[PDB]
Amino acid sequence: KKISGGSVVEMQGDEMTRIIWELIKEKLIFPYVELDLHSYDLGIENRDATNDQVTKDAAEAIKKHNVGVKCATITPDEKRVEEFKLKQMWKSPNGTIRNILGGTVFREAIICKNIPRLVSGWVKPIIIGHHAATDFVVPGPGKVEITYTPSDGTQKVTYLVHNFEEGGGVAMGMYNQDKSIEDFAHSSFQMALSKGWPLYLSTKNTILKKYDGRFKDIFQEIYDKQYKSQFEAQKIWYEHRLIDDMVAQAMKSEGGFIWACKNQSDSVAQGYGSLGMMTSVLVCPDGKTVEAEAAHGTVTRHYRMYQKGQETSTNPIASIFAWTRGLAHRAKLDNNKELAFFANALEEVSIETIEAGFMTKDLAACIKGLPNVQRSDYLNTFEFMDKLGENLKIKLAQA
Amino acid sequence: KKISGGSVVEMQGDEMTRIIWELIKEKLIFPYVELDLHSYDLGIENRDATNDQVTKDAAEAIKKHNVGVKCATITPDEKRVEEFKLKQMWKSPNGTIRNILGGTVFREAIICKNIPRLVSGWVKPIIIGHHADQYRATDFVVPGPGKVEITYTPSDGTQKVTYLVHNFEEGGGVAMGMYNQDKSIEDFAHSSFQMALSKGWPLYLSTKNTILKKYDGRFKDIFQEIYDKQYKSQFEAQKIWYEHRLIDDMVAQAMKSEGGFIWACKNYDGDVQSDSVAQGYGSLGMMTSVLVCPDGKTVEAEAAHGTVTRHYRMYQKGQETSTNPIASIFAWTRGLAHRAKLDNNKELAFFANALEEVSIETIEAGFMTKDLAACIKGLPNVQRSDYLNTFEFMDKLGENLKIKLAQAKL
Ligand SMILES: NC(=O)C1=CN([C@@H]2O[C@H](COP(=O)(O)OP(=O)(O)OC[C@H]3O[C@@H](n4cnc5c(N)ncnc54)[C@H](OP(=O)(O)O)[C@@H]3O)[C@@H](O)[C@H]2O)C=CC1
Ligand SMILES: NC(=O)C1=CN([C@@H]2O[C@H](COP(=O)(O)OP(=O)(O)OC[C@H]3O[C@@H](n4cnc5c(N)ncnc54)[C@H](OP(=O)(O)O)[C@@H]3O)[C@@H](O)[C@H]2O)C=CC1
Ligand SMILES: Cc1cc([C@H](C)Nc2nccc(N3C(=O)OC[C@@H]3[C@H](C)F)n2)ncc1-c1ccnc(C(F)(F)F)c1
Ligand SMILES: Cc1cc([C@H](C)Nc2nccc(N3C(=O)OC[C@@H]3[C@H](C)F)n2)ncc1-c1ccnc(C(F)(F)F)c1
Ligand SMILES: Cc1cc([C@H](C)Nc2nccc(N3C(=O)OC[C@@H]3[C@H](C)F)n2)ncc1-c1ccnc(C(F)(F)F)c1
């Protein structure tokens, strides 16, 4: 008989990840967990048919139920508008969800001992969260100034940005509200306590002494009053770092830390060919609400090959870890030891399978190099899923 | 009876690099090349004793003679004035020289087969370009509610234009203004296009003009309209090209590339994205930098690292050091190669190339300093039998350079 998993918000997506998403639910989730499943179809056609209302409804559902797991979605461009005859170029579902939920996105790579790392000393995962303007054209010579006028009008400060003396150019003003900085701190501290890992904040406060110093000051202030004892209880710590020193410290580290960045990771994973092993999680500052997803997109290029009949080796691990992280967080909110056990076991099974030599083409290329990858070096998407299912069944049986 | 080098402005420096610098001239340059040297001592003693006038003097000579090579110089902080009992926390000579000559700084790592690269697919060097943007920004604290505006006031008395940045309705925060000039973007473009044709590699500019449509669009439009008019004809002769890339597309593209291209970066923190990574990876001694002025003629070449203070203390205390000179050598060779380009000096162009190849081949033959041995075996895992010290390595280079030049007379 199956585990009671509780309230989970699920969002269905597009193209290749949609296929893998259902495979995950059929093969890996539903045979072992029963869910009070709040399910929303963020497929592109249904977003068009509902005028993006389903996107907003999914976000309020995550807000209500604290656990969202999301499949990758097409963000419409002009060519997508014609492909599906869209009513309009709908806004990114991801931007809509985070706008409604707030919080900070943290990315984490999944490490297998048989898989090379970009920096080989990184033997434990590193978790990175980023904090997330008015620009214009200067037609010609003249002063660009930026002014602050307090609501009392008691004073007024006019800062010189630049006096253009030879021709024109460009200029911009940008800002941050304290509250958004504070939320960034709380999410970062909540992430470190949840993971049991130390936390570092990197800034350029040597250069942006006021702008970035505010990030350092608000992080330290919130830490001292609200998290320092909770950190000491888990024997973790928080420290600010100049970005220069953080880069060097990280490259000489073995991993296992949170890195809050004040200035993204998925582009480096894509260059390295490890996007299928990179998970993503949006952490709201309340410490209660989480939205988990893969860091990659719908993998359109693999989906076209699948549509034309050709065989596909798309990596499902990041999509799988979206479910494990969501369910693990659901278990923590509910004190569900059986669900917590299942979520961890599925992560172990995923890593053990790869470390036993059964992997998708991307992983094999990471070991050998793609110009040396023969077809027997890897499994296709569906073989790999079957293999994970066999190994998951065994792991759960052997207990 | 030697190779005629021509007019080169030199800039002497501080501590371990200065020691390296002299070995390079005595062992690698002077025995084969005679130069119209214009030497300036930017050692911090001579900067103090001349009230840092030698620094500004050295810059104009570069503008006069168009080729300069610079040894690493101490930047004065509050702790240096106590060590050197200085009379001022002078500017770093780098910022002085740069704002005088202007132009774009290009970074290039020196690649050896047996020395691993951060991305193994990189078999050819990648050159990063960036104008010499967060450093010229005005930031401040918003202490409480109120309005932040950014305004443009024309110098001809016409109507000022006001842009709202943000209305802080409750609480405060931070705000800042940034800027870039068309003239600097235009120099950036020309310097990049001229670097690509000189090296014979394609060129990419990366912006995020999807987000900063006006700020970064100006970068993209200016590069494109200079390319379409003044360089696309030359670019297609050498089978190369220029193209704009979104920054996140470009990161992935560069990591999948084999190297051998020029990357012009709008938002570039060179101390972070280049030096710090090389510092963490352990290859700062293999990183070179050259300032390319927009005139198409004036360059200043230098190592991308500093005076290596830690090694110098070890050398002062009597201990053996193993300091990598390659980046300092390639400051010379890149300056000489540019001098030969201007003077059509085949004999000097050959010497610069030969010195670059002897440096690379010596390492690929297994003779290297401590840092390069660490890149192979791991930073904490070097034995003394794995490397040569500073002077042992310079001797090995000198011996291989003599043999290389002898075999060239056939
Ligand atoms: N959070 C979200 O919902 C996101 C959605 N998208 C959307 O996805 C669509 C396609 O985006 P695209 O630019 O192709 O980015 P994708 O991440 O979808 O694909 C980029 C490339 O990375 C590799 N890759 C990505 N995921 C995997 C995987 N699971 N297994 C193996 N390889 C993988 C593939 O490279 P190779 O070709 O070398 O195999 C793929 O072609 C777009 O419409 C975009 O809007 C994009 C990002 C995020
Ligand atoms: N262009 C210029 O004039 C610059 C000057 N400086 C100046 O140099 C001084 C020291 O700066 P610092 O922070 O030490 O920067 P350095 O580049 O001098 O040293 C940084 C570290 O990187 C390694 N390293 C650097 N160069 C080499 C090399 N050629 N061979 C082997 N290893 C190398 C050393 O690591 P390890 O200790 O592990 O051996 C060194 O401690 C300061 O006074 C600063 O102002 C700094 C930057 C630029
Ligand atoms: C530290 C870090 C970690 C991660 C991911 C989220 N976490 C992680 N954890 C363990 C391994 C690992 N990765 C690996 O080994 O290769 C692929 C993937 C990685 C994409 F490279 N990624 N993303 C970027 C950085 C990073 C950001 C800025 N600067 C640097 C540097 F200083 F190094 F330049 C590194
Ligand atoms: C160190 C670094 C920092 C930055 C920017 C100015 N600052 C920053 N600070 C923190 C994180 C962060 N990045 C993140 O998280 O992902 C995207 C971006 C980064 C692409 F990683 N970028 N740009 C490039 C590099 C870099 C240069 C060469 N090699 C690598 C690597 F080794 F990673 F391949 C990384
Ligand atoms: C492409 C690149 C090249 C260089 C240097 C001037 N050129 C170079 N050429 C060959 C090898 C080589 N390096 C190597 O092998 O290790 C150390 C050093 C490098 C520091 F990694 N550096 N600096 C930074 C980047 C870069 C900048 C921003 N973003 C990324 C990335 F997209 F990767 F994140 C990479």
From Swiss-Prot, chain A:
It comes from Homo sapiens (Human). Its main location: cytoplasm. The keyword Oxidoreductase applies. The record marks K204 as: Critical for catalysis. The modification N6-acetyllysine is found at K79, K216, K225, K235, K308. Acetylation at Lys-361 dramatically reduces catalytic activity. One of its GO terms (biological process) is glyoxylate cycle. This is Isocitrate dehydrogenase [NADP] cytoplasmic.
